[PDB]
Design a protein around this ligand. Structure first.
Ligand SMILES: CCCCCCCCCCCCCCCCCCCC(=O)O[C@H](COC(=O)CCCCCCCCCCCCCC)COP(=O)(O)OCCN
Ligand code: NA
Ligand code: NA
Lengths: 120, 612
């Protein structure tokens, strides 16, 4: 179960970053996929997930309405589009996948390397 | 011993008085001198964790935790023992969950240190398992009582054996609990939350207490998906009590008793009876004005009814008023209590909805005056139609003598409301200063408060606040479960499908609440529906301060609707009249309340005036 990430870097406010996560070694549809965030030294916080919630994707309270999670079953890819990046989002974003469809991306079994997001 | 069986009493009263003294010191040292203390708030919250858990233990012992018994009382006697036995076993499972995941939290947070106090955080989390053992003790005693009256089926030695066996398994070989893990048996997919929810509803309608029902729902959800996360979510059982906005829940209760047991409400009623009472239907005006002035000190409708019903009914029936109007007006004027600041329903809403409490108070001030004016107008019309006689005007000497006698009481709202509106005091600092002023009033200006009676009032304040603390800390646990699964978003989509304009959404919400409040008590309803109804109001664009005021006023009607009305029962008890008479007498007076509800629904700018 390989989760390889891409995207990120340093931006200003409203930089509208975009992240991608390619998943391999399982059914892209069965496993709930998602992203979580971890500040440089603080506790990890879930960001988003698809296939977790029954009807609509799960978004955290502090990332609602300004983060969008998109799926591409053709290439088995998950995209995260950010909007209005406040300087409090300078952290590491990890792509996770799990065999159980429940909306807790911070406690999912698998996890990728992680990408750095810096906001000035 | 006979002092262990009353242990939460003297361990909660003493800690309550300590917290009260610490907060008083903080207030004085911040206002009188420009030298605030830094260890006051955190130490007071640390003490309040233990105080609230002791209140929860008292509630467990007395079996006073709120339940919904609309359908529970309709079962036959034979078929009710089985359900009650299962409910007791569910409560036992909740207590063992508390013990295990409080001990784990205590042993996990020994490194994080409280900055101001200098002690480790564990001294807070130690409150969760340490009191829980006590709870188990109380539970067993309660069950023995329940067995002495033939209210259960299992002999209370099997319950003791099961309790000690479960504790020994939980602290010796917890692995044996993996048999109960339901995720090994059921694969419900992504729609497990829509099963546990209905399970929750079943538990709610079979008589399980609201706090224990919510905790069992959380346990079921985490057992059905993945247990490994309940070790991290259980922290919300303690983080929800370390709140400074929650300390105002007991104090506003305490100042609602020290203002009755000190013989203060009699003076206020005498002042109102002097000023009014010579008008057309003057005694009704006296009733409503006394309730309006007393609403600025207490924050509960039941306290208002219990403290003023006998006086008001006696004064009204001295003038030849009929029983129906007496009961109806003294029951309808209660609702002015939880509307004018301070109020406890708005504090509960501000905790649940994460809203500001000063803004909630200022917003809810105006609907109280609208209800007061509407009730005065309706009472005037009723009395002028019935043609009741008019009392002679009070002599100019008495109208001043009564005011001077009940002059120090009238300054309590100016300390509270004037302390909150002017921004000098936060709601909790306002609560503490109101408690201090009530003590000065009852013990040193009117000389009617002793030390033993003050301690008893502190103990019963803790006992009252415990049954709210339990529901608060289990609702906080269940809210994240219900909000990560986006149930409220689906319900909001359904509402928007059925309701076109946001006004239609408001009408549908109000009809739902009015229908539910007929059979469900206000306190239980506020935790039953509000967690799953605030997100809908947020999504459809409704302001949440106005929504809180509207829901408070909508549930305050629910204590007058006579399939289940708490105010009707209280007034019937204090007036020596049938509940049928009180229920029939409040029918004319529901029109002004409905008019107020409508004109604040279609003109929200009325409410959102003082906060802005
Ligand atoms: C005469 C009396 C007749 C009636 C008998 C009643 C018996 C049932 C009583 C219910 C007890 C419920 C207790 C709930 C809290 C459990 C406390 C923590 C348990 C725990 O840590 O268990 C982990 C897994 O257990 C789990 O996964 C346990 C989850 C339990 C959830 C609730 C189960 C659903 C209800 C099933 C009812 C069945 C009734 C029929 C008998 C162990 O693993 P670990 O990671 O801690 O490893 C340990 C390494 N340190
Ligand atoms: Na009040
Ligand atoms: Na009253």
């Amino acid at each position: 179960v390989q989760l390889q990430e891409s995207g990120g870097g340093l931006v200003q406010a409203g930089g509208s970053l975009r992240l991608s996560c390619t998943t391999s070694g399982f059914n892209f549809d069965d496993y709930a996929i998602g992203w979580f965030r971890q500040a440089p030294g603080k506790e990890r916080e879930g960001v988003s997930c698809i296939h977790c919630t029954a009807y609509t994707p799960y978004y955290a309270r502090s990332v609602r309405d300004r983060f969008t999670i998109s799926s591409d079953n053709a290439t088995n890819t998950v995209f995260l589009q950010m909007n209005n990046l406040r300087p409090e989002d300078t952290a590491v974003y990890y792509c996770v996948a799990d065999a159980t469809r429940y909306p807790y991306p911070e406690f999912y079994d698998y996890v990728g390397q992680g990408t750095q997001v810096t906001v000035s | 011993m006979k002092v262990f069986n009353k242990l939460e009493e003297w361990l909660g009263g003493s800690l309550f008085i300590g917290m009260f003294v610490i907060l008083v010191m903080q207030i004085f040292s911040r206002q009188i001198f420009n030298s605030p203390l830094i260890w006051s708030e955190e130490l007071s919250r640390l003490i309040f964790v233990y105080v609230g858990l002791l209140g929860v233990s008292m509630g467990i012992r007395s079996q006073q935790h709120i339940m919904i018994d609309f359908l529970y009382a309709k079962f036959p006697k034979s078929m009710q023992k089985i359900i009650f036995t299962i409910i007791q076993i569910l409560i036992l499972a909740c207590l063992i969950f508390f013990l295990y995941f409080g001990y784990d939290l205590f042993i996990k947070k020994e490194e994080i240190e409280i900055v101001s106090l200098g002690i480790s955080m564990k001294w807070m989390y130690l409150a969760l398992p340490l009191i829980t053992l006590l709870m188990l003790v109380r539970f067993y005693q309660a069950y023995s009582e329940n067995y002495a009256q033939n209210k259960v089926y299992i002999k209370p030695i099997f319950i003791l054996a099961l309790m000690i066996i479960l504790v020994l398994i939980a602290f010796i070989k917890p692995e044996l609990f993996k048999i109960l893990k339901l995720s090994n048996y059921f694969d419900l997919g992504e729609m497990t939350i829509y099963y546990v929810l209905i399970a929750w509803l079943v538990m709610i309608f079979f008589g399980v207490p609201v706090g224990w029902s919510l905790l069992v729902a959380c346990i079921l959800y985490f057992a059905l998906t993945r247990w490994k996360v309940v070790y991290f979510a259980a922290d919300k059982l303690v983080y929800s009590l370390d709140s400074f906005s929650l300390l105002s829940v007991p104090f506003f209760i305490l100042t609602g008793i020290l203002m009755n047991g000190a013989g203060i409400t009699e003076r206020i009623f005498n002042f109102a009876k002097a000023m009014l009472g010579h008008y057309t239907g003057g005694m009704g005006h006296v009733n409503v004005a006394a309730s309006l002035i007393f609403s600025g000190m207490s924050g509960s409708a039941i306290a208002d009814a219990g403290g003023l019903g006998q006086l008001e009914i006696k004064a009204m029936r001295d003038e030849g008023y009929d029983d129906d109007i007496c009961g109806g007006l003294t029951a309808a004027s209660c609702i002015i209590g939880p509307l004018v600041p301070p109020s406890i329903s708005m504090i509960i809403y501000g905790v649940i909805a994460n809203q500001s409490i000063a803004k909630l108070f200022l917003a809810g001030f105006v609907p109280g005056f609208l209800t007061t004016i509407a009730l005065m107008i309706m009472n005037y019309f009723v009395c002028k139609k019935r043609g009741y006689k008019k009392t002679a005007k009070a002599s100019p000497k008495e109208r001043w003598i009564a005011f001077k006698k009940s002059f120090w009481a009238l300054l309590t709202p100016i300390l509270i409301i004037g302390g909150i509106f002017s921004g000098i005091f936060t709601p909790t600092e306002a609560a503490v200063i109101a408690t201090f002023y009530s003590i000065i009033l009852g013990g040193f200006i009117y000389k009617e408060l002793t030390v033993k009676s003050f301690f008893k009032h502190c103990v019963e304040a803790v006992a009252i606040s415990g049954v709210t603390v339990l529901m608060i800390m289990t609702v906080t646990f269940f809210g994240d479960i219900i909000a990560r699964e986006q149930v409220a978003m689906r319900v909001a989509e359904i509402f928007i499908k059925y309701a076109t304009s946001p006004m239609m959404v408001l009408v549908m919400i109000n009809l739902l609440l009015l229908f539910l409040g007929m059979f469900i008590d206000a306190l239980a309803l506020q935790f039953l529906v509000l967690p799953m109804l605030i997100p809908i109001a947020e999504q459809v664009g409704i302001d949440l301060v106005f929504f809180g005021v509207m829901t408070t006023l909508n549930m305050m009607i629910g204590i007058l609707t006579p399939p289940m009305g708490m105010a009707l029962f209280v007034v019937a008890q204090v007036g020596k009249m049938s509940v049928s008479t009180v229920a029939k007498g409040v029918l004319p007076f529901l029109l002004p309340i409905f008019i107020t509800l409508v004109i604040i629904t279609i003109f929200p700018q009325i409410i959102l005036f003082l906060p802005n």
